[PDB]
Design an enzyme around this catalytic site. Sequence first.
Site, PDB file in Angstrom:
ATOM      1  N   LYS A 101       2.343  -2.427   9.269  1.00 23.02           N
ATOM      2  CA  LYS A 101       3.668  -1.212   8.920  1.00 23.02           C
ATOM      3  C   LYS A 101       4.955  -1.795   9.318  1.00 23.02           C
ATOM      4  O   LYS A 101       5.177  -2.153  10.596  1.00 23.02           O
ATOM      5  CB  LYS A 101       3.489  -0.100   9.766  1.00 23.02           C
ATOM      6  CG  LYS A 101       4.245   1.189   9.399  1.00 23.02           C
ATOM      7  CD  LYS A 101       3.735   2.312  10.477  1.00 23.02           C
ATOM      8  CE  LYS A 101       4.548   3.760  10.087  1.00 23.02           C
ATOM      9  NZ  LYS A 101       4.001   4.743  10.946  1.00 23.02           N
ATOM     10  N   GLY A 113       8.819   3.786   7.730  1.00 18.15           N
ATOM     11  CA  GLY A 113       8.478   2.529   7.397  1.00 18.15           C
ATOM     12  C   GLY A 113       7.443   2.389   6.167  1.00 18.15           C
ATOM     13  O   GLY A 113       6.967   3.457   5.819  1.00 18.15           O
ATOM     14  N   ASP A 153       0.803  15.440  13.663  1.00 16.86           N
ATOM     15  CA  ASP A 153       0.906  15.400  12.079  1.00 16.86           C
ATOM     16  C   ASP A 153      -0.554  15.097  11.633  1.00 16.86           C
ATOM     17  O   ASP A 153      -0.909  14.197  10.755  1.00 16.86           O
ATOM     18  CB  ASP A 153       1.836  13.990  11.938  1.00 16.86           C
ATOM     19  CG  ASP A 153       1.974  14.089  10.295  1.00 16.86           C
ATOM     20  OD1 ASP A 153       1.995  15.426   9.716  1.00 16.86           O
ATOM     21  OD2 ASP A 153       2.599  13.370   9.733  1.00 16.86           O
ATOM     22  N   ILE A 186       0.680  -1.258   0.005  1.00 15.72           N
ATOM     23  CA  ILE A 186       0.060  -0.039  -0.061  1.00 15.72           C
ATOM     24  C   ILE A 186       0.904   1.129   0.232  1.00 15.72           C
ATOM     25  O   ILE A 186       0.209   2.286  -0.457  1.00 15.72           O
ATOM     26  CB  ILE A 186      -0.960   0.235   1.193  1.00 15.72           C
ATOM     27  CG1 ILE A 186      -1.845  -1.178   1.407  1.00 15.72           C
ATOM     28  CG2 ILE A 186      -1.857   1.409   1.384  1.00 15.72           C
ATOM     29  CD1 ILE A 186      -2.739  -1.185  -0.034  1.00 15.72           C
ATOM     30  N   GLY A 187       2.184   1.185   0.537  1.00 18.21           N
ATOM     31  CA  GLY A 187       2.632   2.505   0.158  1.00 18.21           C
ATOM     32  C   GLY A 187       4.156   2.377   1.277  1.00 18.21           C
ATOM     33  O   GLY A 187       4.847   1.367   1.585  1.00 18.21           O
ATOM     34  N   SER A 188       4.739   3.737   1.333  1.00 19.31           N
ATOM     35  CA  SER A 188       6.326   3.626   1.913  1.00 19.31           C
ATOM     36  C   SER A 188       6.306   4.726   2.914  1.00 19.31           C
ATOM     37  O   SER A 188       5.116   5.050   3.257  1.00 19.31           O
ATOM     38  CB  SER A 188       7.315   4.010   0.795  1.00 19.31           C
ATOM     39  OG  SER A 188       7.370   3.136  -0.169  1.00 19.31           O
ATOM     40  N   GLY A 189       7.420   5.433   3.003  1.00 18.02           N
ATOM     41  CA  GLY A 189       7.513   6.471   4.124  1.00 18.02           C
ATOM     42  C   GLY A 189       9.045   6.478   4.816  1.00 18.02           C
ATOM     43  O   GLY A 189       9.627   5.322   4.673  1.00 18.02           O
ATOM     44  N   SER A 190       9.109   7.499   5.634  1.00 16.88           N
ATOM     45  CA  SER A 190      10.399   7.446   6.230  1.00 16.88           C
ATOM     46  C   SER A 190      10.359   6.794   7.494  1.00 16.88           C
ATOM     47  O   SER A 190      11.455   6.070   7.534  1.00 16.88           O
ATOM     48  CB  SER A 190      10.552   8.989   6.836  1.00 16.88           C
ATOM     49  OG  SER A 190      11.883   8.972   7.566  1.00 16.88           O
ATOM     50  N   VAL A 213       4.044   0.612   4.536  1.00 16.99           N
ATOM     51  CA  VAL A 213       2.797   0.019   4.742  1.00 16.99           C
ATOM     52  C   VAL A 213       2.230  -1.091   3.874  1.00 16.99           C
ATOM     53  O   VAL A 213       2.630  -1.022   2.721  1.00 16.99           O
ATOM     54  CB  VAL A 213       1.694   1.200   4.801  1.00 16.99           C
ATOM     55  CG1 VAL A 213       0.418   0.209   5.426  1.00 16.99           C
ATOM     56  CG2 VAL A 213       1.925   2.169   5.837  1.00 16.99           C
TER      57      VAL A 213
HETATM   58  O1  734 Z   1      -5.160   2.629   3.423  1.00 19.70           O
HETATM   59  C1  734 Z   1      -4.531   3.150   4.650  1.00 19.70           C
HETATM   60  C2  734 Z   1      -3.308   3.788   4.684  1.00 19.70           C
HETATM   61  C3  734 Z   1      -2.956   4.606   3.419  1.00 19.70           C
HETATM   62  N1  734 Z   1      -3.810   5.683   3.226  1.00 19.70           N
HETATM   63  C4  734 Z   1      -4.952   5.790   2.453  1.00 19.70           C
HETATM   64  C5  734 Z   1      -5.895   6.938   2.274  1.00 19.70           C
HETATM   65  C6  734 Z   1      -6.695   7.078   1.289  1.00 19.70           C
HETATM   66  C7  734 Z   1      -6.917   6.015   0.499  1.00 19.70           C
HETATM   67  C8  734 Z   1      -6.197   4.901   0.591  1.00 19.70           C
HETATM   68  N2  734 Z   1      -5.285   4.705   1.399  1.00 19.70           N
HETATM   69  C9  734 Z   1      -1.383   4.908   3.025  1.00 19.70           C
HETATM   70  C10 734 Z   1      -0.841   4.531   2.404  1.00 19.70           C
HETATM   71  C11 734 Z   1       0.467   4.967   2.601  1.00 19.70           C
HETATM   72  C12 734 Z   1       0.813   5.881   3.526  1.00 19.70           C
HETATM   73  O2  734 Z   1      -0.729   5.923   3.869  1.00 19.70           O
HETATM   74  C13 734 Z   1      -2.747   4.384   5.804  1.00 19.70           C
HETATM   75  C14 734 Z   1      -3.027   3.748   7.046  1.00 19.70           C
HETATM   76 CL1  734 Z   1      -2.025   4.094   8.557  1.00 19.70          CL
HETATM   77  C15 734 Z   1      -4.352   2.785   6.900  1.00 19.70           C
HETATM   78  C16 734 Z   1      -4.772   1.848   8.316  1.00 19.70           C
HETATM   79  C17 734 Z   1      -5.435   0.919   7.982  1.00 19.70           C
HETATM   80  C18 734 Z   1      -6.313   0.742   6.942  1.00 19.70           C
HETATM   81  N3  734 Z   1      -5.949   1.442   5.782  1.00 19.70           N
HETATM   82  C19 734 Z   1      -4.802   2.187   5.882  1.00 19.70           C
END
Ligand code: 734
Lengths: 264, 270
Positions: free
Chosen positions: B36, B22, B129, B16-20, B24
């Site tokens: 994460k 860690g 944040d 689902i993603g990256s970041g400083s 996800v």
């Molecule tokens: O989807 C999730 C994200 C992501 N945020 C979004 C925002 C809008 C549409 C889709 N995803 C994301 C990715 C990367 C960094 O943040 C982040 C967290 Cl903590 C989640 C926690 C529980 C379930 N889902 C989560």
Amino acid sequence: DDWEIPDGQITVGQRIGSGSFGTVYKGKWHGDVAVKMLNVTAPTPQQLQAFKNEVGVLRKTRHVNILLFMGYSTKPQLAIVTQWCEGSSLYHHLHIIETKFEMIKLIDIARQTAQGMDYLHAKSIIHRDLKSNNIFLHEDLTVKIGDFGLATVKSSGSILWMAPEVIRMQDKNPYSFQSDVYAFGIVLYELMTGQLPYSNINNRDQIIFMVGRGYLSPDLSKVRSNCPKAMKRLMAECLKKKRDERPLFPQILASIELLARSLP
Amino acid sequence: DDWEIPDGQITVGQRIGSGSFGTVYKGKWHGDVAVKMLNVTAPTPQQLQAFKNEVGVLRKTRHVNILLFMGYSTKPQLAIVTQWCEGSSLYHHLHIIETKFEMIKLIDIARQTAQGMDYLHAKSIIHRDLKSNNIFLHEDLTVKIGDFGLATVKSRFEQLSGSILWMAPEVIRMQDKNPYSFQSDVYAFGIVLYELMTGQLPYSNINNRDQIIFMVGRGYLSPDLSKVRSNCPKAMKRLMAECLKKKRDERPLFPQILASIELLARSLPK
Ligand SMILES: Oc1c([C@@H](Nc2ccccn2)c2ccco2)cc(Cl)c2cccnc12
Ligand SMILES: Oc1c([C@@H](Nc2ccccn2)c2ccco2)cc(Cl)c2cccnc12
């Protein structure tokens, strides 16, 4: 690392009911919450025990399908505070306002419930009173298993959901993951037929006696036609009169997921 | 019974993603969850610290408007497991797909977020944040405040430099001792109220990150409030302005912000 709520922060309101010990109320604490208090100012001995037991179990749970424990208090009265669920219990939906759930939604409710049960068991928690009334449909979607206390972790009536061994009390500790599984079976029966078991028998004692002897059991032929055969089979599996033949949730869960995946 | 997940139970999938702090994932652990992790082969001393600090803060939370912390793992790798939200973030709804929420709903999202912030602050937790990106609209009904990587319990870093739209002037200047406070969180909340009522991000007509940083910090620039929807209650546009006050000590705290939102909600049109 404390869950004790500061004294005098909880505002209590409308009386709801009286599960386990004390009375439940809709209250206020950083929004709406459920508050299970104790009417007496003298907590007595074993009331202070059932209290510590519940908190002890509740505080080991953090899962979307388990009612959210938020904190406890000793304030003027002992009090367990949990999130406030918006909606009704599955029992109320199925047998009081007779809500008409689609089969998809019914499969999903059974899934989430098992999801929840699988979690409790992973933590060595045995509910011991799982029944459609302790299963809440928060916001009409999302199962929240509730009411513990009577729940333990490791070593009125609700007979409709009691496994044969529990009724017999031939161990005095006939409770186990399997008896939790049986109750889930009875819950499956409700969703799948929309009715409580043995509705044609008007004598409770007879019901109790016969389930215990294995003479009576849920009538599965009553399952709605659009009910997947695999579900009806999962149901029968969970309802096995013989304890050790019942499957465990990791398995239940896998079965419900495979039948759900291939449904549309 | 700690919250340390027993080893080898957590499975991870889509990245689902990256970041400083860690990257996800969308793994599994007793149903779907958000994991994460830390890609590195050996965590540096500061990372191990950021990890511990987040877990320390996360485990102190149990509120319907706070993303649900479920557990962590260190043995295989450092991992924080939280409930998996169904849907999108307020940011995505508001600016990426332009969801047409009703004012009653917008006020509601504003209320829940405040409810959550109110909860964090009562436990002495400063988010640091808060922004629409970290506000998940679970099932399009429940607000879940997430991303606790910079959070901290008062009386217990040098990070962040990406999301300046939500930074209070005093946080940009870094002059004062303790630039961060319940008040800077309130300012970020203010920018979110701004986003809710206008449907747009602040300073959309300026395209130079540095100039925006400097200006909001020096007090030369501030959110254009004349853009707020016309059907936006007066008390709300007022509450907004109060949360955005340049002078930190003039902003209201969440208990009062909560009281106001709940009040202006009871007397809304029918
Ligand atoms: O989807 C999730 C994200 C992501 N945020 C979004 C925002 C809008 C549409 C889709 N995803 C994301 C990715 C990367 C960094 O943040 C982040 C967290 Cl903590 C989640 C926690 C529980 C379930 N889902 C989560
Ligand atoms: O609604 C709630 C009930 C009631 N359960 C149901 C189930 C189906 C329809 C209507 N109510 C109830 C109270 C008392 C006896 O049953 C019980 C608890 Cl502990 C609650 C805790 C938090 C939020 N809501 C709760």
